[PDB]
Amino acid sequence: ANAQALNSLLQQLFNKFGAISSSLQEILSRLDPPEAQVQIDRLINGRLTALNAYVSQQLSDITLIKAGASRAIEKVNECVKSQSPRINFCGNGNHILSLVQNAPYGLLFIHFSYKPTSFKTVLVSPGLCLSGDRGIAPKQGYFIKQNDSWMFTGSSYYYPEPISDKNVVFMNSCSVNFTKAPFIYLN
Amino acid sequence: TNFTIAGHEEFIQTSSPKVTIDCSAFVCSNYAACHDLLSEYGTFCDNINSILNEVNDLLDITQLQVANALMQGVTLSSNLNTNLHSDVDNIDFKSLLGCLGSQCGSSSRSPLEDLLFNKVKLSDVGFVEAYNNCTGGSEIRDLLCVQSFNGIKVLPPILSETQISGYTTAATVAAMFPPWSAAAGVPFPLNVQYRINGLGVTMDVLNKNQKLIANAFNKALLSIQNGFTATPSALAKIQSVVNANAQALNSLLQQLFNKFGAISSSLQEILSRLDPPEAQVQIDRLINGRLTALNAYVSQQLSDITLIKAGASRAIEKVNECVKSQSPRINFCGNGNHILSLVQNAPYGLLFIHFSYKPTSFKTVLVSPGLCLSGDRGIAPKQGYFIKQNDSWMFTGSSYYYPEPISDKNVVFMNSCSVNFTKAPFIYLN
Amino acid sequence: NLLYDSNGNIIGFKDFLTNKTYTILPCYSGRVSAAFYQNSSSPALLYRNLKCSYVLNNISFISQPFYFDSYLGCVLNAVNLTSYSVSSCDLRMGSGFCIDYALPSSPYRFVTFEPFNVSFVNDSVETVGGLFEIQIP
């Protein structure tokens, strides 16, 4: 696009623009001096208009260029040299880390993500209530029922583990939509 | 002491109507004697067409980006809403959902979007319905038919409004039924409780006022739906954009009736009254005037497309970081206390629905930023304060008054206490 | 003897030798959008906002063996195959439609443009036995 613009800017020097010849040499030594300004002015007006249009196009493009560059700077500072807690910014939700490389007229990014391959269906419970009007809710995971017993699994893997203090939050009440389990004596 | 939930709407412009101008149909004439002189200017009208095409390409690119941001990481079940219960946990979401079942085709707009689309005439379908009437028999006078025959016509986008409405109503049900993609795998009421818990409200009051939260959500949705009968700000901005586009299109057409130092605005009168060898001056004057007008128009378009792109990027960022996921950034998705956010399709942009946490009653109480325990040990509260009740130290939240005993789950420990901390040797672990 | 509008447009005329009133409507002057493949032989014409009942007898006198009306005007040298959708398309027309080329009648096919989809899973929505049912990697 830059080369096409530069080539189109040069081709405007071979235009007549309402004159008798598209050349400043074929006008001077072809008429009397008083009858040359009328054509030189018309030759100058078109070139000035073309230059103004080119300057306007450059001013319109530089704004988007600077906006993209600022976005690139922000993305570098928030994804390469740091791990921001922002989601759906450096990747597609499962972003891990990113690297930066030099590229012609810009920069190159390499985003690493977390892509699962296999899946497995399982019934989950979004919270339980223990004996004594006490309720518990999982933190980044679910509650499964394996061998008439409740366990805890992650939201992105299926490795069962027993319920502990660092894997569940404690509440002093629970609604009627949760599942009752009075045999979980893991306080 | 008491709280409620309030709603708030917001509109962000994303797209703009695509305008196309003809090279020779508008500059000189449908004739040929004028075109024989326009060739002396070289490829001057080709450069005008090398700007609107790029503007339309940028508009298509940003529309595809918005669609991708709406449809990224979204998975639904096969047993979809086939006339099923659109309400979950006493929360009526039917007023902002279309239809995604096997039936109900060729129409996917929600009842909320219909109120917005029925108050604008120059929508995506409006130009299509107003342009095809210029042949089968239109009214006595129509501006769009006159502008179309002179080289000014508005092209429809690459994606219809129905597809955008479908994308929106599919992204809305994401955080409504398992699996919860837009809630990171958390049910809707538990997600709302987690959102409102981060402000300082304890879990003891949330479980006792679930029906209150449901009624507050229903009342907020009803107030947002009924607020479109009057003149709101989003509809005002949409009408302003439409009127500005119409005024620009009408002002661009009036340049064909100016004189521009010539003898007459009509080009046929100059060629049917004066001899050939003197009409070139008038033709050149008219050509220069109309080319200057077209250059001014394309310059204004290039000036507006930058702000359009900026608004579209802002809308994309909001869609990515407010509705599909929660970002720990205050005063970004709303006004202070922010809980959730919803997106709806709007003419030439998107419509957002923000839910906030608005208290009702207040109470004055004495608080302490920290106390010193026995043994030069320190302790400071987190997301709350320290209050005294019946000559005993307890803990309370920063957004709700509910005393609770001090435990290791609500405070932090320090190896040294400051000199401006209230002494309290009576408390050991209570 | 003349009727004008708000901004300098003649939209009427009265004759003085016949005492009859007429109405002036401008003539048709529009372009055509034609999609052309890499090494095809004839593009796919598209007259926007024009029915083929008016094009086949007032615009183009060439015998067109293929024509059918659509949402954006009738398309020439194409087939009505809107029941088939594509993901990526290089000839975009608008309103969710595009034209793709298939190497063989009319090789141009008028299809639907659906660039984004959603992953479907065969699971239940309502709670079964008080528990949900989701997929875990």
Ligand SMILES: *[C@@H]1O[C@H](CO)[C@@H](O[C@@H]2O[C@H](CO)[C@@H](O[C@@H]3O[C@H](CO)[C@@H](O)[C@H](O)[C@@H]3O)[C@H](O)[C@H]2NC(C)=O)[C@H](O)[C@H]1NC(C)=O
């Ligand atoms: C088109 O319409 C005009 C307007 O009506 C017609 O002009 C009218 O023509 C009639 C018949 O010639 C005139 O009536 C005459 O009036 C004189 C008195 O002035 C009377 O002595 C005659 O016996 C006759 O009744 C009428 O005045 C005249 N109106 C005007 C305003 O000039 C015209 O004839 C119509 N043209 C055609 C082709 O029908």
Ligand SMILES: *[C@@H]1O[C@H](CO)[C@@H](O)[C@H](O)[C@H]1NC(C)=O
């Ligand atoms: C939609 O499906 C098509 C065809 O399977 C595929 O090419 C395209 O990448 C899909 N889009 C998304 C967003 O998954």
